[PDB]
């Protein structure tokens, strides 16, 4: 009989049951989407998009609903922190319900197509054998994909008939769903320009409609039909898998580097924003402008939004996690409650000192403080017997500006050292570690988990492409090589051209 | 070895599968609350 | 709710072990010569 790893090959010559199996797969995926959304809605805390947004809470499908304009709950809240909104039917709950109902209908259709597999439609009218005209099916499906692609861009993304898409400022402070006009100049190919996403779907859709019509109306050349085995449905599997691992690498890349379709209020900040101190620079810019406008130091730092300071913290860096450190980021450092304010360290001479920040590479990192020129001025020693730079010897103090601790100064060395240890992580926050029994160890965000799964799946699908491409092009020898294989066809010297008996010397 | 003449095939028909799965699932639906307690 | 932490594994095995026993017996009945 068939070995276990070939049981599904019974579908190769059975278009009706292949459709049924595809319907069942589609029902399972749609049912996963609905169940996943319900699980997230049953666990999501919507009360604080500033310090407890969805990406701190392990939310995976919630950002995908929000990205395309589903932002409110039937219970009255929205992910931008609004109250008393009416989302209509297409709330998060309505989306979940729709996917569950779709799942059930697809399941019922699968049953019908499994039972009534022997449809005359699936028989070649000349031979009576099962037959799918895959070249024309491609045209039909490409035309349909083009129309849908075009409509998604022309109506949904533009807001002409639809909600638009999530957009935000460069620091992820004020994101919302907006209509987006297409960008038809070279900046439309900028991954951070949302108008290019709109233009893409309009233009690629039109191209898809035209190519679909071409593929409906023009038969494949004989040379290509034979070379790619266009009568063998497994050739379609091979090239479809190739296209899918290409797409999967692309979405892994744009998730990891960031783009207009992976916004930081939905998936969390990127590792590169920590590498380049992206948020620290903007914070420092704003504080300096406040100071240049006559503000006090307390006023300047108190003007920094808590949301901006929170991005300047390594616990939100997606490159700080662990493969088996499971769950939401909140399970590690805790549920963020409030910014403690900006810590300024000074030595006994009054020089401002700066804590060296932890790079993402390091699970642990020493505490070293430098002056504005990078000269070491204090640290936390390991060996004490030859310590020169201890906080006790250098009289290190810490004063806070903005946040909970605004206006306070600490001089007790253990307390000052405690705050210096938090400053290697960037801006300092107060956390609720009790509610979730948080363990104090950093976890990655949905940006990280998405990137991991899709890079891994893409690489595995490379193997599937190779395997099914091989099976397509070598179908004649899948059961072994010709038992009477001419030894002259593999020995040297007999044929001028390898494998061509008509070139026999 | 010489074959053992006492062997017999075993059977479970589809109706018995459905009855047994119903028994197990309903027993589980009943007892799970007490297991979680 | 503070449920017993073994309730999940107890319920899962309570379902799985006898259900699998029946599935094994059913499938090997179907595969017998008719």
């Amino acid at each position: 009989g068939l070995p276990w790893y070939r049981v599904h090959t019974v579908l190769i010559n059975d278009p009706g049951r292949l459709i049924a199996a595809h319907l069942m797969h589609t029902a399972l995926v749609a049912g996963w989407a609905g169940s996943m959304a319900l699980y997230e809605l049953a666990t999501f805390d919507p009360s604080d998009p500033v310090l407890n947004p969805m990406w701190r809470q392990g939310m995976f499908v919630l950002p995908f609903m929000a990205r395309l304009g589903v932002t409110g709950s039937w219970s009255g809240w929205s992910i931008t922190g609004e109250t008393g909104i009416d989302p209509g039917f297409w709330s998060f709950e309505g989306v979940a319900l729709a996917h569950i109902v779709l799942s059930g209908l697809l399941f019922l259709a699968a049953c019908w197509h499994w039972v009534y597999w022997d449809l005359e439609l699936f028989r070649d009218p000349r031979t009576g054998e099962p037959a799918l005209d895959l070249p024309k099916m491609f045209g039909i499906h490409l035309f349909l994909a083009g129309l849908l692609c075009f409509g998604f861009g022309a109506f949904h993304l533009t807001g002409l008939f639809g909600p638009g898409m999530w957009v935000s400022d460069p620091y992820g402070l004020t994101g919302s769903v907006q209509p987006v006009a297409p960008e038809w100049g070279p900046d439309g190919f900028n991954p951070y320009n949302p108008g290019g996403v709109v233009a893409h779907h309009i233009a690629a859709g039109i191209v898809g409609i035209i190519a679909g019509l071409f593929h409906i109306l023009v038969r494949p050349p004989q040379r290509l039909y034979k070379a790619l085995r266009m009568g063998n449905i497994e050739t379609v599997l091979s090239s479809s898998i190739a296209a899918v691992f290409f797409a999967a690498f692309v979405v892994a890349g744009t998730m990891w580097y960031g783009s207009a379709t992976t916004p930081i209020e939905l998936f969390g900040p990127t590792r590169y924003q920590w590498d380049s101190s992206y948020f620290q620079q903007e914070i420092n810019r704003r504080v300096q402008a406040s100071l240049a406008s006559g503000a006090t130091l307390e006023e300047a730092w108190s003007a920094i939004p808590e949301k901006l300071a929170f991005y300047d913290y390594i616990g939100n860096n997606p490159a700080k996690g662990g493969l088996f450190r499971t769950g939401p980021m909140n399970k590690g450092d805790g549920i963020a409650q409030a910014w403690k304010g900006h810590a300024v360290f000074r030595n006994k001479e009054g020089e401002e000192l700066f804590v060296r920040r932890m790079p993402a590479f390091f699970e642990s990192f020493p505490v070293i403080l430098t002056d504005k020129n990078g000269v070491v001025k204090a640290d936390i020693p390991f060996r004490r017997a030859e310590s020169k730079y201890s906080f006790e010897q250098q009289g290190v103090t810490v004063s806070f500006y903005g946040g909970e601790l605004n206006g306070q100064t600490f001089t007790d060395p253990p307390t000052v050292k405690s705050y210096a240890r938090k400053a290697i992580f960037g801006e300092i926050f107060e956390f609720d570690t009790e509610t979730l029994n948080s363990d104090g160890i950093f976890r990655t965000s949905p940006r990280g988990w998405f990137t991991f799964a899709h890079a891994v799946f893409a690489l595995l699908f490379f193997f599937g492409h190779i395997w099914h491409g091989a099976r397509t092009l070598f179908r004649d020898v899948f059961s072994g090589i010709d038992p009477e294989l001419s030894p002259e066809q593999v020995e040297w010297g007999f044929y001028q051209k390898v494998g061509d008996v008509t070139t026999r010397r | 070895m010489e074959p053992n003449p006492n062997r017999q095939p075993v059977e479970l028909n589809r109706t018995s599968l459905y009855l047994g799965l119903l028994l197990i699932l309903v027993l589980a639906l009943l007892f799970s609350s007490y297991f979680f307690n | 709710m503070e449920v017993n932490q073994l309730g999940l594994i107890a319920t899962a095995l309570f379902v799985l072990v006898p259900s699998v026993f029946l599935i094994i017996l059913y499938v090997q009945t179907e595969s017998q010569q008719k």
């Binding site: 699980y39 049953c111 | 109706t15 459905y18 119903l22 799970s32 609350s33 | 999940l8 319920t11």
Partner: peptide
């Protein structure tokens, strides 16, 4: 996790109903 467990078992029962009715052993006169 307990709600998931209860709803899962219920869902398996409803699925069993479906198979027991529409994929039963057909009654046959012989």
């Amino acid at each position: 996790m307990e709600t998931i467990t209860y709803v899962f078992i219920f869902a398996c029962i409803i699925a069993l109903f479906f198979f027991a009715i529409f994929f039963r052993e057909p009654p046959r006169i012989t």
